[PDB]
Amino acid sequence: GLIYAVGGYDGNTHLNSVEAYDPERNEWSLVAPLSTRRSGVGVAVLNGLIYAVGGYDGNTHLNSVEAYDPERNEWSLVAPLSTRRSGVGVAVLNGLIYAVGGYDGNTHLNSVEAYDPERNEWSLVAPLSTRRSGVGVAVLNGLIYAVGGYDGNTHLNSVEAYDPERNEWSLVAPLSTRRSGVGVAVLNGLIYAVGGYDGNTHLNSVEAYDPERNEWSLVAPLSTRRSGVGVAVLNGLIYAVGGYDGNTHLNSVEAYDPERNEWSLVAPLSTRRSGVGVAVL
Known part of the structure; x- marks a missing residue:
């Protein structure tokens, strides 16, 4: 019932701070910060814990992973x-956390690994066709979709779908707009790709993918252009949290209602941030 905004970059500092949003009161509050920026x-x-995976602390590309228990605020x-x-x-998906792609400081990655909490172990699974960082990952009807990103040479419109039962990725219809730093979430059978950067424009456009028709459609745009935006779904609304408009790191947050095809601003974060992870628990 709460949206957590985890980490990010405010333009001056790599952040360890974590903010929690109560939609019924329209308020953010700061909780225990990450141990690592x-x-x-x-x-x-997964199972009542929020996992923060990887990232960059300003000097080290991280393989560390931390888990937040809200009851102990730890x-x-x-x-x-x-x-x-x-x-x-x-x-x-189905009791495993997948870490898709990224950047290790020297190369954009196509590898994918899965964490099993029953084992406290990560294991490599099948790699993506195209390496990518700044990739949005969404789960819909038993498939994981990897959406956009940046391969080090090109801002990507390609979209790959992972079937866990066969351990195979396949390419589906690409985004209409190339999007690195894109946020993705799933609501009522559509995958929404929100914002990002196409290599020359910080985007306010939003597209929705219908898997049955293998088609992306443009929906209402955000009021503010946002790359490096965190996105998650709660109670029928998609929230776009933070990001970077090309000139400033954002503390604003907007919510999309599919019944209205409209975005509306809600309460802003205490600290502006792009490259922020957003989780719902």
């Missing part, structure tokens, strides 16, 4: 990734 951090929720280090990953996409 992390921008470009991926976050996901982050604990868990098993590290096998590969250091900033700009990593992270999502949960």
Whole structure:
């Protein structure tokens, strides 16, 4: 019932701070910070813990992973990734947390690893066709979608879908707009790709993917252009948290209602941040 904004970069500092949003009161409050500063951090929720995966602390690309227990307001280090990953996409499916792509400081990655909390171990699974950081990762109907990113030479529109039962990725319809630093979330059978950077424009446009038709459609744009934006869904609204408009790191937050095809600003974060991970618990 709360949205957590985890880490990021405010333009001067790599952040360890963590803010929690109560939608019923429209307020953010600061909770226990991460132990390690992390921008470009991926976050996901499994069995009552929020996992913060990878990122960059301003001098080290991280393979470390910490887990937050809200009842104790405490982050604990868990098993590290096998590969250091900033700009990593992270999502949960069927009891595993997947860490998709990223950047290890020297190369954009196509590798993907999965964390099993029953084992406290990460294991490599099948790699992506195209290496990518700043990739959005969404889960819909038993498939993981890796959306956009940056391969080190090109801002990507390609979209790959992972079937865990066959351990295989396949390319589906690409985004209409290339998007690195894109936020993604799933609501009522559509995947929304929110904002990002296409290599020359910080985007306020938003597109939605229907898997049945293998088609992306443009929907209402954000009121503010946002790359490095954190995105998550709660109670029928998609929240776009923070980001960077090309000139300033943002503390504003907007919510998309599919019943209205409209975005509306809600309460802003205490600290501006891009490269922020957003989780719902």
